[PDB]
């Protein structure tokens, strides 16, 4: 609402509103909609097919407001607009149209066909965002009405399966709104009022949202199974490919601290290809979904090694040892974050 409309948009939006009005009535007659005295969509009768003057002024004004919200929404998207020229707006060609596609009046509303104009990926993205905003303004109205979501539409209980996020919306209506949006944006472009998209903003949430406030969960064997000597091996399977750590931990490990940040644990972060013990150093490569990581420790020469799907993971050098030397201490147990 805080947005103020430029005069060139003001002298463009009345012509926009009319043009899309006839766009709407041509879409209606192409799909096979007929004129009728009564307000019955199932019986295929509606006085809406006549010109906007004979059309109910409520709908005609609603169309103008509908377009006004659309203009204010292009402006609020951060999509700045430029004026290409004036003569292409003064002179707009008209396709020849078939009689069956024509209504009772001989006037052909379909203006210079938008097929010449091509939709860039950014122009499609803003079409998606306009569709999202229209759906959201559609649902704010329904919620104000008190209509709530329901798996099956209820006329009396005011339940519409339609009140869902646009991503979850049914493909039929989503496409129908999308087409009118797409044709609306193309009509805006064909008015010579070329729109330049805001720069692509990259936003990564890094999965801050989590159960309560826990960032990670640590799974380990019981402290009584600590190994002090010998050769030991266990395997860790990665169903997903995200922030994981696997390795050997001392019985003094804190469940709230990250693996390898302190001296109590030795871990391998394949997500960043990092080996973790009081710091991170580059080691090995990254895993994908389904990769199996093997962990081997030999407390005789105090070495630690790792395998990704069988092959030995190396550090920056040619050495196969993730942690060359450590102390036996109290022992080690398998651990995973």
Ligand X SMILES: COc1ccc2c(c1)CN(Cc1ccc(C(=O)O)cc1)CCS2
Question: What is the C-alpha to C-alpha distance for residues 73 and 96, in angstroms, rounded to an integer?
Answer: 33
- By CB under 6 A, residue 63 contacts ligand X: yes
Question: Residue 21: which of ligand ATP, ligand X, none does it interact with, CB under 5 to 8 A by kind?
Answer: ligand X
Q: Which of residues 155-174 bind ligand ATP (CB under 6 A)?
A: 160, 162
What minimum distance in Å lies between the beta carbon of 147 and ligand ATP? 4
**Which of 63, 73, 123, 274 is the binder for ligand ATP (CB under 6 A)?**
63
Interacting residue with ligand X among 24, 248, 287, 306 (CB under 6 A): 24
Q: Does 147 bind ligand X (CB under 6 A)?
A: no
Under the criterion CB under 6 A, does residue 21 sit at the interface with ligand X?
A: yes
Return left, alpha or beta for 213; rule: phi > 0 is left, psi -120 to 50 is alpha, else beta. alpha
Nearest to 92 by CA among 24, 7, 190, 15: 190
Is residue 52 close enough to count as binding ligand ATP by CB under 6 A?
Answer: no
Does position 236 interact with ligand X (CB under 6 A)? The reply is no
- Mark the segment that binds ligand ATP (CB under 6 A) among 116-124, 139-147, 197-205, 261-269: 139-147
Pick one of ligand X, ligand ATP, none as the site partner of residue 89 (Cβ within 5 to 8 A by kind).
Answer: none
162 touches, from ligand X, ligand ATP, none (C-beta below 5 to 8 Å by class): ligand ATP
- By the rule CB under 6 A, 131 interacts with ligand X: no
Does 227 sit near ligand ATP (CB under 6 A)? no
Q: Which residue is nearest to ligand ATP (CB)?
A: 66
265-274 exposure pattern, b = at least 16 Cβ within 10 A, e = fewer: bbbbbbeebb
Check residue 166 and report its DSSP letter.
G
What, of ligand ATP, ligand X, none, does residue 48 touch, CB below 5 to 8 Å by kind?
A: ligand X
Q: Choose the one of ligand ATP, ligand X, none that binds residue 8, judging by a C-beta under 5 to 8 angstroms depending on kind.
A: none
Per CB under 6 A, 149 contacts ligand ATP: no
- How far is residue 238's CA from residue 179's CA, in Å, rounded to a whole number? 42
Binding mask 82-121 for ligand X (x = CB under 6 A): ----------------------------------------
Which segments within the chain are labelled E, that is strand? 80-81, 195-196, 219-220, 231-237, 246-249, 265-269, 274-276, 280-282, 292-298, 303-308, 311-312, 333-336
Cβ neighbours, 10 Å, residue 154: 13
Choose which of 59, 132, 243, 291 interacts with ligand X (CB under 6 A): 59
Half-sphere CA count of 288, side-chain side, radius 13 A: 0
Neighbouring C-beta atoms of residue 188, cutoff 10 Å: 22
DSSP three-state, residue 115 = coil
- Which of 66, 125, 163, 218: binder of ligand X (CB under 6 A)? 66
Pair 20, 12: CB distance under 8 Å: no
Q: Reduced to 3 states, what is the DSSP secondary structure of residue 312?
A: strand
For 316, the token pair is 């920056």
Check binding of 145 to ligand ATP (CB under 6 A).
yes
13 binds ligand X (CB under 6 A): no
Contacting residues toward ligand X, per CB under 6 A: 21, 24, 48, 59, 63, 66
């Amino acid at each position: 609402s805080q947005i103020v409309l430029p005069p060139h948009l003001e002298r463009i939006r009345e012509k926009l509103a009319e043009n899309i009005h006839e766009l709407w009535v041509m879409n209606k007659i192409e799909l096979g909609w007929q004129y009728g005295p009564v307000r019955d969509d199932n019986k295929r009768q509606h006085p809406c097919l006549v010109e906007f003057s004979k059309l109910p002024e409520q709908e005609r004004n609603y169309n103008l407001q509908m377009s006004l919200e659309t203009l204010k929404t292009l402006l609020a998207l951060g999509c700045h607009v430029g004026i290409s020229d004036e003569h292409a707006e003064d002179k707009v060609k008209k396709m020849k149209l078939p009689k069956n596609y024509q209504l009772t009046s001989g006037y052909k509303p379909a203006p210079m066909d938008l097929s010449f104009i091509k939709l860039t990926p950014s122009q499609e993205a803003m079409v998606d965002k306009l569709a999202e905003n229209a759906h959201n303004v559609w649902a704010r109205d329904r919620i104000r009405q008190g209509w709530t979501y329901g798996i099956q539409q209820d006329v009396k209980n005011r339940r519409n399966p339609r009140l869902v996020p646009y991503t979850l919306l049914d493909d039929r209506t989503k496409k129908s709104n999308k087409d009118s949006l797409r044709e609306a944006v193309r009509t805006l472009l064909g008015y010579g009022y070329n729109l330049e998209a805001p720069d692509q903003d990259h936003a990564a949430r890094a999965e801050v949202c989590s159960g309560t406030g826990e960032r990670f969960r640590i799974f380990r064997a019981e402290k009584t199974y600590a190994v002090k000597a010998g050769r030991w091996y266990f395997e860790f399977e990665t169903v997903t490919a995200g922030d994981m750590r696997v390795g050997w931990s001392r019985p003094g490990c804190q469940p709230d601290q990250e693996l390898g940040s302190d001296e109590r644990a030795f871990a391998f972060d394949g997500f960043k290809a990092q080996r973790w013990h009081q710091g991170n150093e580059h080691y090995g490569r990254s895993w994908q979904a389904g990769d199996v990581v093997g962990c081997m420790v030999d407390m005789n020469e105090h070495t630690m090694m790792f395998t990704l799907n069988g092959e030995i993971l190396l550090d920056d050098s040619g050495s196969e040892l993730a942690f060359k030397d450590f102390d036996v201490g109290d022992g080690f147990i398998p651990v995973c974050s």
